[PDB]
Short mmCIF file of N, CA, C and O in Angstrom, two decimals:
data_model
loop_
_atom_site.label_atom_id
_atom_site.label_comp_id
_atom_site.label_asym_id
_atom_site.label_seq_id
_atom_site.Cartn_x
_atom_site.Cartn_y
_atom_site.Cartn_z
N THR A 1 103.34 70.89 -70.46
CA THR A 1 103.58 71.77 -70.44
C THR A 1 103.73 73.25 -70.82
O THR A 1 104.72 73.14 -70.17
N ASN A 2 102.98 73.85 -71.46
CA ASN A 2 103.79 75.21 -71.76
C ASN A 2 105.11 75.22 -72.13
O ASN A 2 106.08 76.03 -71.50
N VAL A 3 105.49 74.48 -73.51
CA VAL A 3 106.45 74.30 -73.63
C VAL A 3 107.61 75.98 -74.02
O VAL A 3 106.63 76.71 -74.93
N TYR A 4 108.40 76.17 -73.84
CA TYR A 4 109.06 78.07 -74.13
C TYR A 4 110.00 77.45 -74.60
O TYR A 4 111.12 76.91 -74.07
N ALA A 5 110.87 78.12 -75.97
CA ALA A 5 112.05 77.98 -76.60
C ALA A 5 113.24 78.88 -76.12
O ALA A 5 111.97 80.40 -77.21
N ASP A 6 114.39 79.49 -76.15
CA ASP A 6 114.86 80.32 -75.90
C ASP A 6 115.84 80.59 -76.01
O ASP A 6 116.81 79.20 -76.39
N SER A 7 115.79 80.54 -77.76
CA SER A 7 116.87 80.44 -78.02
C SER A 7 117.51 82.21 -78.86
O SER A 7 117.46 83.29 -78.80
N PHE A 8 119.05 81.92 -79.29
CA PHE A 8 120.18 83.43 -79.09
C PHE A 8 121.43 82.35 -79.78
O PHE A 8 121.21 80.99 -79.54
N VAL A 9 122.66 83.28 -79.81
CA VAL A 9 124.03 82.80 -80.44
C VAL A 9 124.42 83.52 -79.35
O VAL A 9 124.43 84.49 -79.19
N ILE A 10 125.57 82.82 -78.87
CA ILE A 10 126.89 83.18 -77.88
C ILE A 10 128.13 82.79 -78.18
O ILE A 10 128.34 81.66 -79.38
N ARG A 11 129.26 83.22 -78.25
CA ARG A 11 130.44 82.84 -78.67
C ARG A 11 130.99 81.36 -77.38
O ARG A 11 130.06 81.43 -75.75
N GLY A 12 131.75 80.88 -77.56
CA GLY A 12 131.68 79.54 -77.01
C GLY A 12 132.73 79.91 -76.03
O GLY A 12 132.47 79.45 -75.09
N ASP A 13 133.13 80.79 -75.38
CA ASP A 13 134.64 81.62 -74.42
C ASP A 13 132.89 81.55 -72.94
O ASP A 13 133.43 81.25 -72.19
N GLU A 14 131.58 81.69 -72.94
CA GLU A 14 130.70 82.34 -72.04
C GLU A 14 129.79 80.37 -72.44
O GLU A 14 128.85 80.90 -71.60
N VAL A 15 130.00 79.93 -73.24
CA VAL A 15 129.02 78.83 -73.38
C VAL A 15 128.52 78.11 -72.07
O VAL A 15 128.19 77.79 -71.29
N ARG A 16 129.24 77.86 -71.43
CA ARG A 16 129.85 76.67 -70.22
C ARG A 16 129.39 77.39 -69.26
O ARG A 16 129.07 76.67 -68.09
N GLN A 17 128.76 79.07 -69.63
CA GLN A 17 128.86 79.99 -68.00
C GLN A 17 127.44 79.70 -68.11
O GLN A 17 126.83 79.87 -66.41
N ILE A 18 126.13 79.22 -68.72
CA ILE A 18 124.80 79.91 -69.16
C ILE A 18 124.47 78.10 -67.79
O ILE A 18 124.43 76.92 -68.61
N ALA A 19 124.18 78.40 -66.83
CA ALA A 19 123.36 77.18 -65.92
C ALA A 19 122.77 78.29 -65.27
O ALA A 19 123.03 79.07 -64.90
N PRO A 20 121.85 77.37 -64.01
CA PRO A 20 121.06 78.31 -63.53
C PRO A 20 121.49 77.54 -61.80
O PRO A 20 121.38 76.95 -60.97
N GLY A 21 122.35 79.41 -61.37
CA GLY A 21 122.21 79.63 -60.34
C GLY A 21 123.80 79.78 -60.36
O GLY A 21 124.35 80.25 -58.63
N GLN A 22 124.36 80.29 -61.07
CA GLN A 22 125.99 80.84 -61.04
C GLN A 22 125.74 82.38 -61.53
O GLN A 22 124.70 82.37 -61.61
N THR A 23 126.68 82.44 -61.81
CA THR A 23 127.38 84.27 -61.59
C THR A 23 128.33 84.22 -63.38
O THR A 23 127.75 83.04 -64.44
N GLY A 24 128.19 85.66 -63.65
CA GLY A 24 128.87 86.29 -64.62
C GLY A 24 128.70 87.28 -65.98
O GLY A 24 127.68 87.40 -64.97
N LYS A 25 128.98 86.78 -66.68
CA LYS A 25 128.75 88.05 -67.57
C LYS A 25 127.37 88.03 -68.22
O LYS A 25 126.77 89.62 -67.89
N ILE A 26 127.15 87.03 -68.71
CA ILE A 26 125.69 87.08 -69.34
C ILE A 26 124.51 86.48 -67.96
O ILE A 26 123.48 87.22 -68.18
N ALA A 27 125.18 85.52 -67.28
CA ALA A 27 123.90 85.24 -66.51
C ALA A 27 123.71 85.84 -65.69
O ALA A 27 122.60 85.72 -64.72
N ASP A 28 124.72 86.83 -65.42
CA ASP A 28 124.03 87.48 -64.34
C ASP A 28 123.16 88.96 -64.72
O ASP A 28 122.13 89.61 -64.12
N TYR A 29 123.66 89.38 -66.15
CA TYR A 29 123.05 90.69 -66.78
C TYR A 29 122.14 90.88 -67.76
O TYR A 29 121.64 91.80 -68.37
N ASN A 30 122.29 89.64 -68.83
CA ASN A 30 121.48 89.11 -69.35
C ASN A 30 120.10 88.67 -69.38
O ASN A 30 119.18 88.45 -70.09
N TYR A 31 120.29 87.65 -68.58
CA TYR A 31 119.13 86.42 -68.71
C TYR A 31 119.55 85.93 -67.15
O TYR A 31 120.38 85.71 -66.83
N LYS A 32 117.95 85.66 -66.88
CA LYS A 32 117.93 84.28 -65.26
C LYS A 32 117.27 83.20 -65.51
O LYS A 32 116.50 83.22 -65.78
N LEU A 33 118.23 82.18 -65.67
CA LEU A 33 117.62 80.51 -64.71
C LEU A 33 117.48 81.06 -63.92
O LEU A 33 118.11 80.98 -62.84
N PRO A 34 116.32 80.27 -63.07
CA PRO A 34 115.22 80.50 -62.15
C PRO A 34 116.77 78.77 -61.34
O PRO A 34 116.79 77.95 -61.73
N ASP A 35 116.77 79.06 -60.37
CA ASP A 35 117.43 78.11 -59.34
C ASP A 35 116.32 76.42 -58.93
O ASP A 35 117.18 75.33 -59.18
N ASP A 36 115.26 76.65 -59.10
CA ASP A 36 114.09 75.99 -58.62
C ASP A 36 113.57 75.32 -60.45
O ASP A 36 112.94 74.44 -60.61
N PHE A 37 113.64 76.03 -61.78
CA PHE A 37 113.85 75.71 -62.63
C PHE A 37 114.28 74.40 -63.20
O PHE A 37 115.30 73.89 -63.00
N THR A 38 112.96 73.24 -63.85
CA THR A 38 113.12 72.50 -64.14
C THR A 38 113.39 72.51 -65.90
O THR A 38 112.30 72.72 -67.03
N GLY A 39 114.90 72.23 -67.05
CA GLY A 39 114.45 72.51 -68.26
C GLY A 39 115.37 71.57 -69.25
O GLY A 39 116.49 70.69 -67.88
N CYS A 40 115.87 72.00 -70.32
CA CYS A 40 117.45 71.59 -71.40
C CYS A 40 117.62 73.00 -72.69
O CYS A 40 116.87 73.04 -72.25
N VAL A 41 119.01 72.43 -72.28
CA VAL A 41 119.83 73.71 -72.44
C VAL A 41 120.52 73.12 -73.75
O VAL A 41 121.45 72.35 -73.18
N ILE A 42 120.02 73.19 -74.83
CA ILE A 42 121.34 72.61 -76.82
C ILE A 42 121.77 73.68 -76.83
O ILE A 42 121.10 74.71 -77.28
N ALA A 43 123.62 73.32 -76.87
CA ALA A 43 124.44 74.52 -77.54
C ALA A 43 125.02 73.88 -78.55
O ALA A 43 125.24 73.02 -79.02
N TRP A 44 125.00 74.08 -79.74
CA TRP A 44 126.09 73.66 -80.86
C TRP A 44 126.29 74.83 -81.57
O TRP A 44 125.77 75.81 -82.06
N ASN A 45 127.89 74.15 -82.60
CA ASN A 45 128.21 75.81 -83.44
C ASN A 45 127.90 75.75 -84.35
O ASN A 45 127.37 74.17 -85.07
N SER A 46 127.44 76.46 -84.86
CA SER A 46 127.08 76.92 -86.65
C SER A 46 127.91 77.61 -87.05
O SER A 46 127.81 78.89 -87.31
N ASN A 47 129.06 77.25 -87.90
CA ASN A 47 130.38 77.75 -88.46
C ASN A 47 129.46 78.48 -90.40
O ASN A 47 129.97 79.76 -91.04
N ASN A 48 128.64 77.41 -90.74
CA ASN A 48 128.73 77.77 -92.13
C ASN A 48 127.25 79.44 -92.49
O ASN A 48 127.25 79.63 -93.69
N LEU A 49 126.91 79.29 -91.29
CA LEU A 49 125.93 80.59 -91.85
C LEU A 49 126.24 81.52 -90.44
O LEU A 49 125.62 82.86 -90.46
N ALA B 1 153.55 89.00 -65.85
CA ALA B 1 153.98 90.23 -65.87
C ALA B 1 155.08 90.81 -66.72
O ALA B 1 155.59 91.59 -67.17
N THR B 2 156.11 89.66 -67.07
CA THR B 2 157.62 89.69 -67.20
C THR B 2 157.60 88.03 -67.90
O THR B 2 158.41 87.54 -68.58
N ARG B 3 157.72 86.97 -66.64
CA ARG B 3 158.67 86.22 -66.91
C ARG B 3 158.27 85.35 -65.30
O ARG B 3 158.27 86.20 -64.16
N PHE B 4 157.54 84.36 -65.28
CA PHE B 4 157.91 83.37 -64.48
C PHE B 4 158.46 81.92 -64.08
O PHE B 4 159.17 81.20 -65.27
N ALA B 5 158.96 81.11 -63.25
CA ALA B 5 159.44 80.08 -62.87
C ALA B 5 159.48 78.97 -63.21
O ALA B 5 157.46 79.19 -63.39
N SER B 6 159.90 77.78 -62.95
CA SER B 6 159.52 76.40 -63.41
C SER B 6 158.13 75.97 -62.41
O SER B 6 158.11 76.58 -61.56
N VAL B 7 158.35 74.68 -62.44
CA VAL B 7 157.47 74.54 -62.16
C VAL B 7 158.42 73.74 -59.85
O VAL B 7 157.35 73.19 -59.17
N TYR B 8 159.45 72.86 -61.24
CA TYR B 8 159.51 71.37 -59.84
C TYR B 8 160.80 72.60 -58.75
O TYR B 8 160.85 72.75 -57.38
N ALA B 9 160.89 74.04 -59.26
CA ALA B 9 161.12 75.24 -58.55
C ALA B 9 159.82 76.31 -59.32
O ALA B 9 160.48 76.96 -59.33
N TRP B 10 158.81 76.37 -58.43
CA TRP B 10 158.00 76.76 -58.24
C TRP B 10 158.09 77.81 -58.07
O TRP B 10 158.53 78.48 -56.90
N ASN B 11 157.77 79.49 -57.94
CA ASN B 11 157.42 80.23 -57.77
C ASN B 11 157.18 81.11 -56.56
O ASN B 11 155.78 80.29 -56.84
N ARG B 12 156.90 81.70 -55.98
CA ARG B 12 156.40 82.15 -54.68
C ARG B 12 156.03 83.43 -54.79
O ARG B 12 157.47 83.59 -54.61
N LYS B 13 155.58 83.74 -54.08
CA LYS B 13 154.98 85.14 -53.59
C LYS B 13 154.14 85.17 -52.93
O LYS B 13 153.36 84.59 -52.71
N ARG B 14 154.67 86.54 -51.66
CA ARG B 14 153.78 86.67 -50.77
C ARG B 14 153.20 88.08 -50.61
O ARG B 14 153.99 89.12 -51.34
N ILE B 15 151.72 88.08 -50.15
CA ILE B 15 150.95 88.94 -50.72
C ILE B 15 150.50 89.55 -49.30
O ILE B 15 149.61 88.51 -48.28
N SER B 16 149.90 90.35 -48.82
CA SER B 16 149.18 90.66 -47.66
C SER B 16 149.18 92.74 -47.53
O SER B 16 149.82 93.25 -48.14
N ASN B 17 148.44 92.58 -46.33
CA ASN B 17 148.76 93.24 -45.97
C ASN B 17 147.71 94.76 -47.41
O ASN B 17 148.20 96.11 -47.50
N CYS B 18 147.10 94.28 -48.40
CA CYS B 18 146.15 95.29 -49.48
C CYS B 18 144.99 94.92 -49.66
O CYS B 18 144.68 93.32 -49.09
N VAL B 19 144.14 95.23 -50.54
CA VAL B 19 142.99 94.70 -51.11
C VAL B 19 142.68 94.22 -51.82
O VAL B 19 143.48 94.05 -53.43
N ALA B 20 141.64 92.76 -51.50
CA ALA B 20 142.09 91.70 -53.28
C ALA B 20 140.72 91.69 -53.81
O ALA B 20 139.48 92.58 -53.40
N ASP B 21 140.76 91.28 -54.73
CA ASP B 21 139.43 91.62 -55.35
C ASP B 21 139.33 90.44 -56.93
O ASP B 21 140.35 89.72 -57.39
N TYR B 22 137.66 89.58 -57.20
CA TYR B 22 138.17 88.97 -58.60
C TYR B 22 137.76 88.92 -59.28
O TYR B 22 137.71 89.09 -60.60
N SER B 23 136.60 90.50 -59.55
CA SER B 23 135.97 90.63 -60.83
C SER B 23 137.44 91.70 -61.80
O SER B 23 137.03 91.67 -62.48
N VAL B 24 138.52 91.98 -60.56
CA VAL B 24 139.38 92.77 -61.70
C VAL B 24 140.29 91.83 -62.76
O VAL B 24 141.52 92.19 -62.81
N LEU B 25 140.28 90.39 -62.33
CA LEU B 25 140.96 89.33 -63.18
C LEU B 25 140.88 88.84 -64.57
O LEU B 25 141.43 88.90 -65.37
N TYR B 26 139.40 90.34 -65.22
CA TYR B 26 139.14 89.49 -65.83
C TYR B 26 138.79 90.92 -67.25
O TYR B 26 138.80 91.16 -68.26
N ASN B 27 140.18 91.90 -66.83
CA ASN B 27 140.57 93.02 -67.24
C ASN B 27 142.23 92.95 -68.09
O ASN B 27 141.72 92.59 -69.71
N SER B 28 143.17 92.38 -67.76
CA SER B 28 144.39 92.32 -68.08
C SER B 28 144.71 91.13 -69.39
O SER B 28 145.41 91.66 -70.27
N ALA B 29 143.99 89.80 -69.03
CA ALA B 29 143.98 88.54 -69.42
C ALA B 29 142.34 88.12 -69.43
O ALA B 29 142.42 87.79 -67.50
N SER B 30 142.41 87.03 -70.16
CA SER B 30 140.70 86.27 -70.47
C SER B 30 141.32 84.87 -69.73
O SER B 30 142.15 84.31 -70.78
N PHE B 31 141.26 84.82 -69.04
CA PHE B 31 141.63 83.03 -67.89
C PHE B 31 140.95 81.98 -69.02
O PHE B 31 139.90 82.27 -69.59
N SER B 32 141.49 80.68 -68.98
CA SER B 32 141.00 79.51 -69.69
C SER B 32 140.08 78.70 -68.23
O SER B 32 138.92 78.20 -68.05
N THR B 33 141.13 78.11 -67.54
CA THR B 33 140.83 77.01 -65.85
C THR B 33 140.54 78.11 -65.15
O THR B 33 142.10 78.86 -64.79
N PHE B 34 139.62 78.56 -64.30
CA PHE B 34 139.44 79.08 -63.14
C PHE B 34 138.62 78.36 -62.01
O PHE B 34 137.57 78.31 -62.35
N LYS B 35 139.20 77.66 -61.20
CA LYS B 35 138.18 77.17 -60.29
C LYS B 35 139.30 76.79 -58.80
O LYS B 35 140.31 76.67 -58.19
N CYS B 36 138.52 77.85 -57.64
CA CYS B 36 138.34 77.86 -56.53
C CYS B 36 138.00 76.64 -55.49
O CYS B 36 136.76 76.62 -55.33
N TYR B 37 138.87 75.67 -55.27
CA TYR B 37 138.32 74.34 -54.21
C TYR B 37 138.16 74.63 -53.31
O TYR B 37 138.15 75.68 -51.96
N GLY B 38 136.72 73.98 -53.33
CA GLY B 38 135.35 74.65 -51.87
C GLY B 38 135.12 76.09 -51.90
O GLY B 38 134.17 76.04 -51.24
N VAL B 39 135.81 76.87 -52.58
CA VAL B 39 135.12 78.84 -52.41
C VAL B 39 135.04 79.24 -53.76
O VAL B 39 135.21 78.60 -54.55
N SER B 40 133.01 79.36 -53.39
CA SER B 40 132.77 79.59 -54.80
C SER B 40 133.48 81.36 -55.24
O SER B 40 133.74 81.68 -54.12
N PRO B 41 133.96 81.24 -55.97
CA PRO B 41 134.05 82.80 -56.84
C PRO B 41 133.23 83.71 -56.55
O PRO B 41 134.05 85.70 -56.26
N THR B 42 132.11 83.57 -56.19
CA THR B 42 131.57 85.15 -55.89
C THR B 42 131.45 85.65 -54.55
O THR B 42 131.27 86.92 -53.91
N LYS B 43 131.82 84.98 -53.41
CA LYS B 43 131.74 85.28 -51.94
C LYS B 43 133.58 85.56 -51.62
O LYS B 43 133.34 86.29 -50.45
N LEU B 44 134.53 85.87 -52.10
CA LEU B 44 135.81 85.95 -51.41
C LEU B 44 136.46 87.28 -51.43
O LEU B 44 136.46 87.33 -49.99
N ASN B 45 135.38 88.27 -52.22
CA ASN B 45 135.82 89.71 -51.34
C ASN B 45 134.36 90.15 -50.74
O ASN B 45 134.75 91.28 -49.49
N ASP B 46 133.87 89.21 -50.05
CA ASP B 46 132.91 89.22 -48.36
C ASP B 46 133.91 88.75 -47.38
O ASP B 46 133.81 88.64 -46.13
N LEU B 47 135.05 88.07 -47.61
CA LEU B 47 135.66 87.60 -46.69
C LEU B 47 136.95 88.05 -46.12
O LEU B 47 137.55 88.24 -48.25
N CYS B 48 137.71 88.57 -45.18
CA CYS B 48 138.58 88.78 -44.93
C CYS B 48 139.97 87.65 -45.20
O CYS B 48 140.06 86.91 -43.92
N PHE B 49 140.99 87.55 -45.77
CA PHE B 49 141.76 86.18 -45.84
C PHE B 49 143.25 86.96 -44.96
O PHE B 49 143.34 87.85 -45.25
#
């Protein structure tokens, strides 16, 4: 129910940090992943564009 | 700083009687592997080592 897609582009140095419950430069002050949240995260490199 | 020792003759340093921090570790150089076994990095300043 109610599929929401949050899309952005980041450097590979912070890709491993985005996860629901940790800290960091981006995880603390740019977005908040809830701890009880259930979902999926997909990251893929895009050099051609 | 300038140069460190090898692994078989591992370099030993003694530190006490001062204030320590973990957020100050991300200024002089960006690190690659940072794993604190058993201890979460967010709480280290809240305990008194």
